[PDB]
Amino acid sequence: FLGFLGAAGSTMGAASMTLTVQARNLLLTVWGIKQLQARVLAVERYLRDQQLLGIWGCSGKLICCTNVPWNSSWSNRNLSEIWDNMTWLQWDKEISNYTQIIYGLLEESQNQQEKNEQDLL
Amino acid sequence: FLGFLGAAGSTMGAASMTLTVQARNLLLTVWGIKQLQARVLAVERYLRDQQLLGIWGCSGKLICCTNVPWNSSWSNRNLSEIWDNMTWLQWDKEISNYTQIIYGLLEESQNQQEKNEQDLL
Amino acid sequence: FLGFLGAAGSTMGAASMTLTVQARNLLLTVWGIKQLQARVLAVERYLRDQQLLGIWGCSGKLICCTNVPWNSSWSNRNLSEIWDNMTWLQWDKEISNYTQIIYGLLEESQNQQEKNEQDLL
Amino acid sequence: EVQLVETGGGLVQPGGSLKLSCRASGYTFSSFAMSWVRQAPGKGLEWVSLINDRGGLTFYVDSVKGRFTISRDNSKNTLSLQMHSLRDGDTAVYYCATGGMSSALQSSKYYFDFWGQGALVTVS
Amino acid sequence: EVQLVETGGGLVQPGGSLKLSCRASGYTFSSFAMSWVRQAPGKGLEWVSLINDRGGLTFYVDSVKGRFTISRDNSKNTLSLQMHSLRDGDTAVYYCATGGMSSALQSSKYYFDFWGQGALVTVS
Amino acid sequence: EVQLVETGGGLVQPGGSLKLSCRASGYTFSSFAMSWVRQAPGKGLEWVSLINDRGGLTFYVDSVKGRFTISRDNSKNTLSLQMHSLRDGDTAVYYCATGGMSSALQSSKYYFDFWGQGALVTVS
Amino acid sequence: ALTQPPSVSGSPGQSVTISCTGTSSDIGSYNYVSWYQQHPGKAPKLMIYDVTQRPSGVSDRFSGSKSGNTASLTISGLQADDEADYYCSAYAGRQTFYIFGGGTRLTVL
Amino acid sequence: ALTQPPSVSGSPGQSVTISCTGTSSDIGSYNYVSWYQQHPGKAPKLMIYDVTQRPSGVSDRFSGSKSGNTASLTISGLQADDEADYYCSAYAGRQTFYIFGGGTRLTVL
Amino acid sequence: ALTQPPSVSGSPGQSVTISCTGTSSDIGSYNYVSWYQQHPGKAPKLMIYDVTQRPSGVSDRFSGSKSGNTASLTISGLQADDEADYYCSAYAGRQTFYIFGGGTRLTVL
Ligand SMILES: *[C@@H]1O[C@H](CO)[C@@H](O)[C@H](O)[C@H]1NC(C)=O
Ligand SMILES: *[C@@H]1O[C@H](CO)[C@@H](O)[C@H](O)[C@H]1NC(C)=O
Ligand SMILES: *[C@@H]1O[C@H](CO)[C@@H](O)[C@H](O)[C@H]1NC(C)=O
Ligand SMILES: *[C@@H]1O[C@H](CO)[C@@H](O)[C@H](O)[C@H]1NC(C)=O
Ligand SMILES: *[C@@H]1O[C@H](CO)[C@@H](O)[C@H](O)[C@H]1NC(C)=O
Ligand SMILES: *[C@@H]1O[C@H](CO)[C@@H](O)[C@H](O)[C@H]1NC(C)=O
Ligand SMILES: *[C@@H]1O[C@H](CO)[C@@H](O)[C@H](O)[C@H]1NC(C)=O
Ligand SMILES: *[C@@H]1O[C@H](CO)[C@@H](O)[C@H](O)[C@H]1NC(C)=O
Ligand SMILES: *[C@@H]1O[C@H](CO)[C@@H](O)[C@H](O)[C@H]1NC(C)=O
Ligand SMILES: *[C@@H]1O[C@H](CO)[C@@H](O)[C@H](O)[C@H]1NC(C)=O
Ligand SMILES: *[C@@H]1O[C@H](CO)[C@@H](O)[C@H](O)[C@H]1NC(C)=O
Ligand SMILES: *[C@@H]1O[C@H](CO)[C@@H](O)[C@H](O)[C@H]1NC(C)=O
Ligand SMILES: *[C@@H]1O[C@H](CO)[C@@H](O)[C@H](O)[C@H]1NC(C)=O
Ligand SMILES: *[C@@H]1O[C@H](CO)[C@@H](O)[C@H](O)[C@H]1NC(C)=O
Ligand SMILES: *[C@@H]1O[C@H](CO)[C@@H](O)[C@H](O)[C@H]1NC(C)=O
């Protein structure tokens, strides 16, 4: 159907079915250096996102359901507005200021989970 | 026992016990650039295969059992011929034309599985 | 609390709560080449460790409990000394000579586990 | 206004099989989970089966778990219930209903919003 | 020398609720797992619940599994046990004890090292 | 032509232990899964245990699950069954048989291809 | 399952209460207790969902609540048109999804 | 487990049928129902495997099939050499791997 | 759970043995069988842990061992101060963590 970013204007729940479409598009000596820098950067950016998913316990997934509650102060909206009316670009603007808080919480709940699972073994 | 590619002439079921042997072997300014390009490429090729396993739900595995049925039209042979007589080089030639079909099916069944698992939580 | 390597002088069980602190810090043409080589190497070193965790069955984890027994000949100490008195730098020296043995055992037990899990499906 | 119309045979021998179906209209079929509920000839209501909106996940009451199959086709707006083996204890009115589950990306239901009128099935 | 002191009410009606607590001293509270054990008025000992040293993992005997909650606060050196519903069969002396589990990075226990004197709870 | 020969003691006291073994020849031992089946002195056949071709996976019938161990040594072409505790109800002829499982990379069996003659075990 | 077997009655204008008693690993732990109305010979209608909420089209004569392991349906300005059987149901977790009680017959006097 | 207790009989040259009845979460759902022949005092021999297939060395006098939850073994040109007990077994899934029925004694008249 | 109901007795200076019998998926499989001493009216004290070990502060008059599914507590130089109830307990795996037997009353003669 749609190709890369074709779902950008779609709602969040219509999109998020195309996650593999975007994931797969992330992959004279002076010209050689400029291009190696571009390629090295693409790899480094990719790996930082993968490392981050790993420490949150979401390695290998495109959709990862976590064990952190949603604070209503981050966005006081119902699922109907978020998944049926909004697009991902709009959502990203709405909660930009809470991104680092959420990320810190995700890392911490994984550290606790990982240890509890060791004690049970 | 055998080192890198030593199992190449072995049958498919004799091989496939050596998967870590091959996996571990995948890792004047002009000379510097030629070598950086070779190294950058090795990394990019490695990561594309890992990304692909990830979207199929096989991250972190060397052997991954999936939920896609085998169409007899891709290769109408019994397990005895495939695993006991054939080598992997022969097999690769036999089903070369079906590789993209199979890959598309693997991606799609994972998308469905991943969503069903979200609804169950 | 502590930042990068701040736990280096702490005991092994006090440390190992800071694993994400260290994991996240691993990420004129002549100057361009020297820096690309440094960046390419950082990526290659990172990926070798990740590949190794993968073949041991520990992909995506910071703490991975395995199915290999500990030979008392590698270090004849009780958990109390190892986790409460020693630091990781001291431990690393104590068992340096057994690292390759342990790694070989981890790879082998994973190969057996992975196959047993295929037969059960 | 929505409609749910049950169709299907109403008289079978024990040991046989029976397929019921339910045609839906007036709402987006594909947006809702659906279920079947029995009304015993002289008693109350019993839940029998539930299917997800996309048709991938099904659930059953233990008493029919190894006997009944629930299926959905979103292109025709229909449900079906395939009964097998059949017991005298399965005589009931079978109602088609909308609700029961949720899709985890929308508000939950866990209740039944709409009901059809019911197919009557007798096991002789 | 360590101390474990149970406090809490001792007389409730069936169908009600009761919270018991246990103050600890003389040892690092946070280094040990803890549990509650009942002494029936005229019989023996029964294990009821266990909590991990960090408070994240709890375990229960089936007979109270849907009724009791065990909790820990390492900043106050206290345990608590919240009883609900309450049955006549729950009349007992409730002892606070240290031990029961382990933390998998230290030697195991699987026994109880220290005991308090016990709170007496009667269900009328 | 293949052979399976059961050996092992035939008379034990209840509460004791007994080890049986089975020597195989005429086929690649390591290519097949194997099992033990009992023949009651006056009744029918009962499956007791199953071991995978590589020796890593074992399965048991509930009645011996906490008592019997099945083991294999592919370098000697032998099976063994270690009985413990022993009940009067365990008196039977114990047959060594080839089959039962599969290796998931070859055609399945789920049947027994070859049988030995059986060791007779009596619990007094 | 859930229980409440008796008939229930009262005169027009009087309120009535219909009980629904379950257990802890059922009605106690989940706040999903709907109520349905059924005139004999007709399919059931949803009256109350979740605990207290009513569907659009349902009058305010119908309300409900829960305490402990017991839920109840309240009918206020009782009408002759309320002569129907009433059933409660509840989500009982995964594995056992839904249970119902028997219903009660409401008689208007 | 599986059931079929009676003796079975017939004269040489007559066919006989030996039944094997199980349940749905057994014989109904899995097509793995082998049959074994045992002369008293001897180890069993495999006659039929899967449903209809026979091992090499087994004559065509032995065949079988299944319907619903019942399987059966058919013996055609009955011989005096068929006087053996016959057993059916079935794969019953993981956890409960195999079950057997009692066997039947075949008497040649 | 674990069993040993009788009273136990002997004169000062005589040894006594207190049994504790369990099952295989309990005391047989795990070596975690502690013993506790309780004077009436007082909280229990740990005497033996694991199988044979004693806590510091516990005298060498107390020792113990196990065989098969039966454990036992041995008291050697029996004192009048040993008049207490004795209980055995055991780790019984995950899910069922601990079980206890009834205790025995030790009478010094
Ligand atoms: C764009 O908006 C219209 C408005 O209804 C919608 O129907 C359409 O599907 C949207 N585009 C995409 C890609 O969904
Ligand atoms: C939600 O965020 C506010 C600040 O925005 C914070 O005070 C509150 O504790 C948070 N709630 C939870 C449950 O953490
Ligand atoms: C829920 O959705 C409705 C849209 O009908 C909206 O009016 C209401 O404000 C939303 N609730 C919240 C939490 O804002
Ligand atoms: C959100 O989507 C629903 C879908 O039917 C639509 O009815 C509603 O008006 C939309 N709300 C907004 C604010 O766009
Ligand atoms: C994020 O910070 C900017 C800073 O000016 C502020 O204007 C904006 O409203 C903040 N966003 C939210 C969602 O509060
Ligand atoms: C090469 O073919 C022969 C033919 O039997 C076989 O035995 C041998 O093992 C094969 N080589 C390898 C590496 O398996
Ligand atoms: C198998 O492949 C053929 C075409 O090669 C296709 O028509 C058929 O539907 C496929 N079978 C399945 C089960 O998808
Ligand atoms: C199965 O294997 C045999 C080898 O004995 C072969 O003759 C037969 O053709 C194979 N079946 C198929 C599907 O071709
Ligand atoms: C396949 O391998 C088996 C192993 O014994 C051998 O007997 C058979 O002849 C082989 N078939 C072919 C076509 O090589
Ligand atoms: C793959 O395509 C080529 C194109 O000529 C064809 O010759 C070959 O037979 C195809 N392979 C298969 C397995 O059909
Ligand atoms: C350094 O050693 C002292 C000795 O007790 C200890 O208390 C302190 O915490 C140690 N430093 C760190 C980072 O733990
Ligand atoms: C432990 O190591 C020694 C050699 O250091 C080796 O001989 C012994 O077999 C090892 N033990 C185990 C259980 O592998
Ligand atoms: C165990 O720890 C103690 C410290 O009290 C030490 O003396 C002893 O040597 C340790 N055991 C071993 C295995 O060395
Ligand atoms: C190990 O740590 C414990 C913690 O209390 C301390 O008592 C002990 O003396 C330490 N041992 C050594 C050898 O430092
Ligand atoms: C490791 O090898 C060196 C080589 O001299 C040796 O001195 C050292 O003791 C060895 N380490 C251990 C733990 O044996």
Short mmCIF file of C-alpha atoms in Angstrom, two decimals, chain F:
data_model
loop_
_atom_site.label_atom_id
_atom_site.label_comp_id
_atom_site.label_asym_id
_atom_site.label_seq_id
_atom_site.Cartn_x
_atom_site.Cartn_y
_atom_site.Cartn_z
CA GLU F 1 17.46 -57.07 11.54
CA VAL F 2 17.76 -55.23 14.78
CA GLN F 3 17.98 -56.38 18.33
CA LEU F 4 17.03 -54.92 21.64
CA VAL F 5 18.01 -56.89 24.68
CA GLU F 6 16.72 -56.10 28.10
CA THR F 7 18.77 -57.03 31.12
CA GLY F 8 18.44 -56.21 34.80
CA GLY F 9 17.27 -57.73 38.06
CA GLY F 10 13.78 -59.14 38.41
CA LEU F 11 13.09 -59.21 42.15
CA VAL F 12 12.98 -56.38 44.57
CA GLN F 13 11.43 -55.36 47.82
CA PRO F 14 8.96 -52.46 47.85
CA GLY F 15 10.68 -49.35 49.05
CA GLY F 16 13.91 -50.28 47.22
CA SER F 17 15.42 -49.51 43.82
CA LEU F 18 16.22 -51.27 40.55
CA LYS F 19 18.18 -50.51 37.45
CA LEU F 20 17.25 -52.02 34.09
CA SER F 21 19.13 -51.66 30.87
CA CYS F 22 18.75 -52.33 27.17
CA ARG F 23 21.52 -53.08 24.69
CA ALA F 24 20.79 -52.21 21.09
CA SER F 25 22.27 -53.34 17.82
CA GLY F 26 21.72 -53.46 14.03
CA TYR F 27 20.78 -49.81 13.53
CA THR F 28 22.19 -46.43 14.30
CA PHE F 29 21.30 -46.10 17.95
CA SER F 30 21.78 -42.38 17.96
CA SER F 31 19.22 -41.82 15.19
CA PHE F 32 16.24 -42.97 17.22
CA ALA F 33 14.21 -41.92 20.21
CA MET F 34 13.44 -44.69 22.66
CA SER F 35 10.92 -45.65 25.30
CA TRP F 36 9.84 -48.12 27.93
CA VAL F 37 6.45 -49.85 27.97
CA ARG F 38 5.04 -52.06 30.75
CA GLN F 39 3.05 -55.21 30.41
CA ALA F 40 1.07 -55.89 33.52
CA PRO F 41 1.18 -59.60 34.56
CA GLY F 42 -2.45 -60.07 33.56
CA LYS F 43 -3.52 -56.97 31.62
CA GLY F 44 -2.41 -54.66 28.79
CA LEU F 45 0.34 -52.27 27.79
CA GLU F 46 1.22 -49.00 29.47
CA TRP F 47 3.64 -46.32 28.35
CA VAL F 48 6.11 -45.33 31.06
CA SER F 49 8.88 -43.16 29.72
CA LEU F 50 10.44 -41.60 26.63
CA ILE F 51 13.88 -40.25 25.85
CA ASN F 52 15.05 -38.16 22.89
CA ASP F 53 17.73 -39.41 20.49
CA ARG F 54 20.35 -37.06 21.91
CA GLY F 55 19.41 -37.83 25.53
CA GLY F 56 18.50 -34.25 26.51
CA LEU F 57 14.73 -34.53 26.81
CA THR F 58 12.80 -36.98 28.89
CA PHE F 59 9.12 -37.57 29.48
CA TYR F 60 7.21 -39.69 32.01
CA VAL F 61 3.79 -41.09 32.76
CA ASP F 62 2.43 -39.40 35.88
CA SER F 63 2.43 -42.57 37.96
CA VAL F 64 6.27 -42.81 37.94
CA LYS F 65 7.06 -39.17 37.38
CA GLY F 66 8.70 -38.56 40.72
CA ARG F 67 10.21 -42.04 40.96
CA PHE F 68 11.83 -43.17 37.69
CA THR F 69 14.77 -41.84 35.68
CA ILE F 70 15.39 -42.60 32.00
CA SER F 71 18.87 -42.27 30.61
CA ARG F 72 20.80 -42.91 27.44
CA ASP F 73 24.42 -43.43 26.42
CA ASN F 74 24.98 -43.23 22.70
CA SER F 75 28.57 -44.42 22.87
CA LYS F 76 27.59 -47.86 24.21
CA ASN F 77 24.31 -48.23 22.40
CA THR F 78 22.41 -48.53 25.68
CA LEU F 79 19.35 -47.37 27.55
CA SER F 80 18.78 -47.49 31.19
CA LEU F 81 15.85 -47.07 33.49
CA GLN F 82 16.43 -46.37 37.14
CA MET F 83 13.54 -47.24 39.36
CA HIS F 84 13.21 -46.00 42.92
CA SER F 85 10.74 -46.46 45.76
CA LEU F 86 8.93 -49.26 43.94
CA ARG F 87 5.35 -50.24 44.48
CA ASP F 88 3.52 -53.55 44.18
CA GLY F 89 1.66 -51.92 41.30
CA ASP F 90 4.95 -51.69 39.37
CA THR F 91 5.21 -55.43 38.84
CA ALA F 92 5.37 -55.89 35.09
CA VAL F 93 7.38 -56.91 32.13
CA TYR F 94 9.38 -53.91 30.99
CA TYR F 95 9.93 -53.64 27.29
CA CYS F 96 12.59 -51.69 25.55
CA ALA F 97 11.27 -50.12 22.39
CA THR F 98 12.44 -47.89 19.59
CA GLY F 99 10.21 -45.04 18.47
CA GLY F 100 7.83 -42.76 20.33
CA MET F 101 9.17 -39.35 19.43
CA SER F 102 10.89 -37.67 16.45
CA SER F 103 13.71 -35.14 15.95
CA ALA F 104 11.80 -32.29 14.18
CA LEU F 105 14.04 -32.28 11.17
CA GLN F 106 12.94 -35.66 10.01
CA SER F 107 9.63 -37.44 9.57
CA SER F 108 7.71 -38.05 12.73
CA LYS F 109 6.97 -41.36 14.26
CA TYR F 110 4.67 -41.35 17.22
CA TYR F 111 4.57 -45.17 17.14
CA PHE F 112 6.94 -47.93 18.26
CA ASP F 113 8.97 -49.67 15.48
CA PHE F 114 10.97 -52.21 17.38
CA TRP F 115 10.52 -54.11 20.58
CA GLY F 116 12.84 -56.15 22.80
CA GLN F 117 11.55 -59.17 24.72
CA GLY F 118 11.24 -57.61 28.11
CA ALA F 119 12.70 -57.79 31.58
CA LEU F 120 10.47 -59.17 34.28
CA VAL F 121 10.32 -57.19 37.47
CA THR F 122 8.55 -58.35 40.59
CA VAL F 123 8.01 -56.25 43.67
CA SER F 124 7.54 -58.38 46.79
#
